[PDB]
């Protein structure tokens, strides 16, 4: 998980985290999903671009970004704060 190892282990990424927020993920799995999303966000550097989206019968962004961002400290903080606010409600739709 060290920055030098991550830099030397692969190439820069254009990552899009897709989060399921349908009703079935309510409970323990939603909290685990939030923690996992934060942990994976912690694996990105300034050369990677990331955005987080959620879908429950309809897909939308979780923050005020609306596209990929540089994934620096401030953007990652915003994404983490937005992610640790989601609620499980609705019906899953993977196509959308």
């Amino acid at each position: 998980r060290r920055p030098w190892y991550i830099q030397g282990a692969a190439s820069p990424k254009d990552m899009l985290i897709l989060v399921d927020v349908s009703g079935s993920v309510s409970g323990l799995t939603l909290k685990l999903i939030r923690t996992s999303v934060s942990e994976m966000l912690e694996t990105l550097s300034d050369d990677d671009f990331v955005n987080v989206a959620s879908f429950n019968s309809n897909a939308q962004d979780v923050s005020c970004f609306q596209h990929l961002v540089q994934a620096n400290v401030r953007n990652k903080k915003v994404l983490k704060d937005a992610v640790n606010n989601i609620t499980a409600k609705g019906i899953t739709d993977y196509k959308k």
Partner: protein
Amino acid sequence: WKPFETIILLTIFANCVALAVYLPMPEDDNNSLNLGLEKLEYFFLTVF
């Protein structure tokens, strides 16, 4: 007087089976089977 009650008993058993296979989901979630059973619920209602 014809064995009509047997058909009603069989359809009651079918309704009980349909109730058994229903899978409750949290926070207004569903799957294909639950939607299929909801439509089948009208068939029992019409017969009854």
